[PDB]
Design a protein around this ligand. Structure first.
Ligand code: CU
Ligand code: CU
Ligand code: CU
Ligand code: CU
Ligand code: CU
Ligand code: CU
Ligand code: CU
Ligand code: CU
Ligand code: CU
Ligand code: CU
Ligand code: CU
Ligand code: CU
Ligand code: MG
Ligand code: MG
Ligand code: MG
Ligand code: MG
Ligand code: MG
Ligand code: MG
Lengths: 299, 299, 299, 299, 299, 299
């Protein structure tokens, strides 16, 4: 069922309402379920999934929102959701606090205010740690800045806030670097952005020349210490964790992340000759094994 | 014999005196001695140690102090002390300059002015390099900034200068990420912060939530290319090598270091729910094998 | 045949002329050729090379120059040149665009305007990716800033522009960190800076005390995820990708890069005691196997 | 508990009495006991020991003495004492004669006249042979020549008879070359003289250069076919098995022994510069792993 | 088919006659033949043999005899006989001289005067060297001294000359130490003296107390660098290569030989308590795997 | 460049002068240099060499000479020269005394009086021991007896003193048994006398029948415990370490040495049929892998 092309630009914004205090509330339903995923045609991986897909749903909210994630375990092992973000210890999704792990058939609502703004992620933190992550229990968590709380960077914040006219000008994509050890010997056999090896070689990502591009880039790769992103023929600005509104790194073409690191890349192909522009890990073996894709820059 | 709980807050400041010039002088005695260390109850590692402990003593001085380290080798192999700091070539603690390696029964006094301020480390640099480090000859070296030399940053410099009333408001900890290859095949079997696997799970580190937290974090891990630190439920500011009084990275929750890298982490649990807040490597294998700890945040 | 001591300070600036536009043109000739290279005396490696050496020629131009690289393949396999730099898709040196791979006996002229200013590199991007890089098809590509286009940073840009009186004060070196898998099992047996293991221990790099030092440092090491640079007894400023004229990191002594990353290091031994100051990877095994050198600081 | 520095010069001469015949009688108590031994600080070896030490007690008697060794097995496995000396078959300490093996809780008295004079040894001879030796059941057995039975060699015989004024001019040492397979795969991981690896590098053996030196040297090393002794900067005379009062080999600096071989080395540092003079196996691997020591020659 | 108990005392002295010179001639017939041999009951080894047994026939002559060995090859591979002895190059039994190797169906008569007196051996020297020896082509070759040519040592020479009344007093045995690699991976699985593992534990060698004992001991063991002989409860004199009539080593109980070395051991159990006296390699693993025997000393 | 045939009979006697005391002085210049050596045509070994050759120069002096060896390290690692011979501890060439190891670019003069007479050797003693030896840093060191100091053995001493009429009658050769682990797994793949596998099979060593032969035989082989020498068709006298003027062993054809042992072999082919007489290790695998040669006895 998983569609890596639709996944690129799918934002789950939840069912929105207003709390008695006036605070915006966003509610999400997440079910852990054991399910086959196809990481290449005829390559079946037995995954543990959030909502039947790997990566899990890309959750996207605004700084200051109240977030409720109704988590139900319909799997066979205990699971949690550990968010990278600010929240109480009892909402941290680790085995030793709060409700602990959520056992098969049980439910729990993670609830917190969405801080800090930036690019984040969530993943299972069960026993043992590496197993539940590698099996597929990870996803993206994006907290848009509230432009009313950043007057000194108003234009930047508005460009990131989903649905403003300024944000509609941007071409936004979410990319989770992941990998799979199909024979379960703690070494990856397949690498990818968004699970399907070479998916963006088979169908390049169409890019309109005149508009800028923003990527929310997350490293969920297990076993290997780092992953990386190299943009052919062009340079980008990098925002580590996306937690600042000015770049961490200006004018680079290769960055690296250990697992759990992530950030925002911004660049533009304005004025570029139309054609295919490659992007891939600069660990060459990862790129050969599926972590390589093409932007199709059109005029 | 090693106490990882006392080690967290123990600073060796030396025997202090004043040179004729009026410059402050700090003197340290360090003895290399072969010794067993317990890295888990019932797991004995045959170490080469500075002063009978792994990590070695945490040395803490002030920028511009004259430092004398009286080094004596009571072991069976040649050793040195190589400091990560500014010093003359003959004081660099490598085989090919100055006294060279210090053989069993020999002595040498490393002497230098303490520059630059920041978070540093020292370790053996003998033959072969990886062996003397892995065996346990490494420690922390902290140079507090002299606030009188940083007028534009007096408040930040005073917050780091040991014993100041501004400094006493901070909760300071030293954390050395290390690992041990028990069967000596150049692959770590046990990982830890401050040597004892899971020590801060058995006994969490108590934090008063009203006061901010500062960690001096150093990577001494051999064989593996990087190590990392992920703070649950919260974000910190990172000061690479601690050599600036303004942060290198603002608002992150996961950073990585290669061996010999190090820096300062500052954050606060003010206003957080009392509970257990985890900290650990984001290389999952490392965390399972002992590089996982808990902060106990209290009212 | 390869001289690592001359390579350190050799800049290929090309056949220079003026287009009808008035724009400066620099032409280079690059031939791919299969050739033995000696990575230690008596250790022969079967290389694929650019112009008969590994690393390939260091090409150095000015921001805004028109660059033409006439590439001919006199080897036995297809090859390309992929530049890290801004250029059209058809000039990106990858198999699926423009002329594609350049087969034995074929020629192709890569042409682009030299942007952005900074420290870059080129390497083969053929099938399979890791093979052509490991075999030796990589080199440095340095784009000096045009001081006229950076008024607020004139002095910094003049110090980097090859040939100016400000630039002549600087002691500039190029260092490619590489490695060789002699038994072709995807694991390096030999590490180095500029190909020849321990070359700068046999013959240290002479540094005059009273003039600053600039290193263009590039990671071309295959298979291993990262490489690193530690400067003994001193600290440097680091300019990631060299693409900014102010430092990325201030006052550091150990930095790391994944493959394809690179940057500029600036430091000074002014006032230091003359002698040998070591520099090497902080991955201890790389240092033992050849990636270790000495600066000989003189008066 | 084992002190390799005291062991060098410790002779067990027994409880001495006179039989009705007038023959001298020396009585020894030896108890087999399973015990941990430290072969390096933090390296514990589970040994089978004679009197709680490896090597066992060095027994020293005079040619023609009646010897009674009261053996008691306080271990968990059957053991014997097999002496390298002249004795009846029923006193030979092998499974198939006399009392056979001595089972836990059993006792037996080995009794024989001490012949021939020279340097000998004793060790377990149980099933399997290699296991009981490797586990630590071996020791030195020295039979001093009776000068009254060697008129033509009275001066040499008196130089060896313990306590004589001629003997007191000599500096005598006992050295057992041994090894330990810590993971029990029939390959030694640690080598030593007198058990503790590098013990005489940590603390050199003090020699008065005016007085000659005699070493009783015994090979107890299992698995490896030979062991050896190289004396730096000097030459010695070798007495194979110590069974002649004139040398077997004159003026050599390197000798080898298979297991169970042994002999006497005599030399002098008279007139030599005070300094450290090395002694070690000429099997380089053995020396690196702990069979290396220093003589400290003093005025 | 092979009887290790008869082999011990079997001397082949040849078809004896007188040349026209007056010089004694001894003729022997040796056939190479491929044959199974039993190295323990139920353990069959595919041998290449001289005259259908391993070791080959023990040939015993007198110093100065003319020797003719008519060699025929009835095997499937080429073979030679290389004697340890003085002879012309054309009679040396190596591939590149004289007749070369002797191929299936071919014959050749090796002819030489028997010098020097001592304990020697013969073996195949074909391609590859180790294969033909391991497969079983070796045997003893004993040259008795001519008492007439050694006036100052008449008694010693008479005691070695087969058949004299002095020689009849001696109990003479021949012992070839050998080994077998049954899975042909160049590592012995079975060790022995005279081929049959533990043959002299099953049936000890009867020794009359009041007569001395002489052993002709030869090392034919392949792959392992040395073999050894330890006599329990007694000491012997050793005559290296048997080529001197006075001992090389006096009063020893453990001696070692590399392959092709050999010598004579002389000892006496006169006055000993009757019983079993063990003899075996002091390489413990060889002894466990078959190279261990017993003398049964009688009254 | 290395010529194993010229090496056989090349004696480096140094530049000779007379000290103020009247003592003869011999000075030698030795440079450590990394260099390829060819151990078979097309088999390149990356060696560490003394004066660009393996084995190093054969140094030959007279008992009582003052020896000065001006050692310069032009290599990439630290090195020493450890002589087997009598000398002060500060001249012993070990890391822990005197100047210690000699680092790249440094120089040191080893100086001592040449005692005792005999056959000796020199080799590097650096960290780790086995590596520097195996890499090629070993050579022969021969101290001729001074006939004026040995009146009782005047003829013997004169026969060994280089250049006397008596010595000119002898045919003298130096033979260093060595081996190379080409894949650096601590097991030799190639064996040889004087480095080049089978060199004296390709060109036999021409021997004049009427004159006696003397070989200075040294074991420099690493990893394997022993090496050996078997002389076909003839017997020799052996002088252990060459330190005595009468034989250690009379009339043998096979001797063995552990590493660092050495000695003198003397024999004669007077009266022998002209032809090829083989000599080789009696460890058969060594002989197959290159340690085999031929004497060509001519009339
Ligand atoms: Cu889970
Ligand atoms: Cu995470
Ligand atoms: Cu050390
Ligand atoms: Cu360091
Ligand atoms: Cu290519
Ligand atoms: Cu690249
Ligand atoms: Cu026992
Ligand atoms: Cu024994
Ligand atoms: Cu054969
Ligand atoms: Cu032979
Ligand atoms: Cu060396
Ligand atoms: Cu040596
Ligand atoms: Mg796998
Ligand atoms: Mg390990
Ligand atoms: Mg490899
Ligand atoms: Mg073992
Ligand atoms: Mg086998
Ligand atoms: Mg090998």
């Amino acid at each position: 069922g998983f569609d890596p092309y639709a996944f690129l630009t799918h934002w789950e914004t939840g069912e929105v309402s207003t709390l008695p205090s006036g605070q915006t509330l966003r509610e999400f339903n997440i079910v852990a379920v054991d399910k086959e995923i196809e990481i290449a045609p005829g390559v079946y991986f037995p995954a543990w999934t959030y909502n039947g897909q790997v990566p899990g749903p890309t959750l996207r909210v605004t700084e200051g929102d109240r977030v409720r994630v109704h988590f139900h375990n319909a799997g066979s092992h205990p699971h949690t959701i550990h968010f990278h973000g600010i929240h109480p210890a009892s909402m941290d999704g680790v085995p030793g606090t709060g409700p602990g792990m959520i056992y098969p058939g049980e439910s729990f609502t993670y609830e917190f205010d969405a801080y800090p703004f930036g690019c984040h992620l969530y993943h299972c933190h069960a026993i043992p740690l590496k197993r539940h992550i590698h099996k597929g229990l990870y996803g993206a968590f994006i907290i848009d800045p509230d432009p009313e709380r950043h007057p000194e960077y108003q234009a930047a914040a508005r460009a990131r806030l989903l649905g403003t006219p300024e944000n509609q000008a941007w071409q936004e994509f979410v990319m989770v670097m992941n990998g799979f050890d199909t024979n379960f010997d703690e070494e990856n056999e397949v690498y990818a952005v968004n699970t399907v090896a070479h998916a963006y070689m088979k169908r390049p990502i169409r890019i309109e020349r005149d508009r800028p591009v923003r990527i929310y880039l997350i490293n969920a790769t297990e076993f290997d210490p780092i992953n990386s992103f190299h943009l052919h023929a062009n340079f980008f600005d990098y925002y580590d964790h996306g937690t600042t509104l000015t770049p961490t790194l200006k004018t680079v073409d290769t960055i690296m992340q250990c697992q759990g690191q992530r950030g925002i890349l911004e660049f533009s192909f304005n004025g570029f000759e139309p054609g295919l522009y490659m992007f891939h890990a600069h660990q060459s073996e990862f790129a050969e094994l599926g972590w390589m894709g093409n932007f199709e820059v059109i005029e």
